[PDB]
Amino acid sequence: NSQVTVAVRVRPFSKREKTEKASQVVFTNGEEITVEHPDMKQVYSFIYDVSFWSFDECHPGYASQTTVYETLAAPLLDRAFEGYNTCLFAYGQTGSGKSYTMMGLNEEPGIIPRFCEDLFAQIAKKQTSEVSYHLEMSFFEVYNEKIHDLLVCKGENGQRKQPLRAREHPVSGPYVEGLSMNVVSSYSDIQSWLELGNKQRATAATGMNDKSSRSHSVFTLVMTQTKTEVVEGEEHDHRITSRINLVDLAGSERCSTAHSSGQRLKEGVSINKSLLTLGKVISALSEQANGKRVFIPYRESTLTWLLKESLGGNSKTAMIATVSPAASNIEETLSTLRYATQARLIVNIAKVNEDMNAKLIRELK
């Protein structure tokens, strides 16, 4: 089997929201995230695999950064050190708390640095001069189904981002023609590459934020593990490689509540199509794991086509969604809750928790 671990991070209230007294609409009951519109009408309920209640630091089950890491990412490291492939998707709207979860701040670090440093630590523990490791990484983006390299020195002129193309190797699967790769030995030599890429990544000001993401981003870390057998015959030939993919996805963005035209419209359509195809892929993989063999439409998008070998077979996939609990963003949070979901979401009416002043059926009983 190869299942898909879907998870959700409920951001806590920010200072602006506490000052405006923006009321809470996303609540938890443990194994369920519930949405109760302030009108107290159709109450939505979603059952995921893992729920991260980062809402209030004193509530039971408080999802710290270390908690989230040990919950989702570390099994991907343990899997990578077995010779299998791993993929971590990050989805969320802007302001929902996605970068906090993936990257982190100067303090309270996130999945990216935690995974990197724990990886290097386990590498050091497993170094013997009988077993060796090599780490090579790349970082690229997808924009209107065209691939661009993020680690390339570029000047200022018109239409400078030269598009690369995907190609299918019969054994190794799909790849990008002309994409650069760079060798690493720590995290301090990853940070300066990521900071070079995230400045070339496409952005544009919109009704949601003046600096939003408008292109999918893939950071791929390729590990090669070399072994040697003591039979005096297998000279540095036992090779096994693994790929860890970390994919920052852009938001859906409805073109109805944002009157747009031209390039922003095109970007939204492309992003939307990519997300739809990714959802089809994840659902079909879930069905495959539950037994019924199906056809995965990998080929309907550059992202899925390039990530084909990292979302199938003997592999591990995780999808971290990030949602905000404020009532000011019902449509986006529900859009992000309806998206990241493999099972069936249930809806009811639950304004009848006010039967008689904290029901008090204790009296009736």
Ligand X SMILES: Nc1ncnc2c1ncn2[C@@H]1O[C@H](COP(=O)(O)OP(=O)(O)O)[C@@H](O)[C@H]1O
Contact between 293 and a copy of itself (CB under 8 A)? Answer: no
Length of the chain in residues, anyone?
365
Pick 124 or 358: Cβ nearer a copy of itself = 358
Q: Select the span of 46-54, 62-70, 248-256, 354-362 touching a copy of itself (CB under 8 A).
A: 354-362
Question: 249-268 mask for ligand X (x: CB under 6 A)?
Answer: --x-----------------
Q: To 10 degrees, the CA torsion angle through 274, 277, 279, 284?
A: -160
- Bridge partners of 138, per DSSP, are 220
Q: Out of 99, 215, 315, 329, which residue is the one contacting ligand X (CB under 6 A)? A: 99
Kindly name the residue from 2, 45, 62, 100 that is annotated as catalytic: 100
Shortest Cβ distance from residue 171 to a copy of itself (Å)? 16
Shortest Cβ distance from residue 355 to a copy of itself (Å)? 12
Consult the annotation and say whether 291 binds a ligand. Answer: no
Q: 131: closest CA among 240, 221, 220, 232? A: 240
Structural element, H or E, at residue 323: strand 315-323
Consult the annotation and say whether 97 binds a ligand. Answer: yes
Kindly name the residue from 251, 268, 270, 312 that is annotated as catalytic: 251
Pick 171 or 356: Cβ nearer a copy of itself = 356
Question: 192-231 mask for ligand X (x: CB under 6 A)?
Answer: -----------------x--xx------------------
- Residues whose CB falls within 8 Å of the CB of residue 28, separated by 6 or more in sequence, listed in order: 10, 34, 51, 53, 55
Shortest Cβ distance from residue 132 to ligand X (Å)? 37
Q: How many CB atoms lie within 10 A of CB 323?
A: 27
118 is catalytic: no
Contact between 358 and a copy of itself (CB under 8 A)? Answer: yes
316 is catalytic: no
CB-closest chain residue to ligand X: 97
Distance CA 216, CA 147 (A): 10
362's contact among ligand X, a copy of itself, none, with CB below 5 to 8 A by partner kind, is a copy of itself
Consult the annotation and say whether 92 binds a ligand. Answer: yes
Q: Out of 131, 205, 240, 360, which residue is the one contacting a copy of itself (CB under 8 A)? A: 360
Kindly name the residue from 95, 110, 197, 268 that is annotated as catalytic: 95
What is the edge-to-edge ordering of all strands in the sheet holding 33-35? 26-28, 33-35, 43-46, 346-348
Cβ burial, residue 193 (10 Å; 0-12/13-18/19+): middle
DSSP for 64-106 reads -HHHHIIIIIHHHHHHHTTT-EEEEEEEE-TTSSSHHHHTB-S
Contact between 181 and a copy of itself (CB under 8 A)? Answer: no
Question: What are the helix (H) ranges across the chain?
Answer: 15-20, 65-68, 74-80, 99-102, 111-126, 188-200, 263-289, 302-306, 330-339
Pick 96 or 341: Cβ nearer ligand X = 96
328 is catalytic: no
Contact between 211 and a copy of itself (CB under 8 A)? Answer: no
SS3 287: helix
Contact between 58 and a copy of itself (CB under 8 A)? Answer: no
Pick 153 or 231: Cβ nearer a copy of itself = 231
- Bridge partners of 46, per DSSP, are 33
Residues of each annotated binding site for ATP: 92-99
Active site residue ranges: 95, 97-100, 248, 251
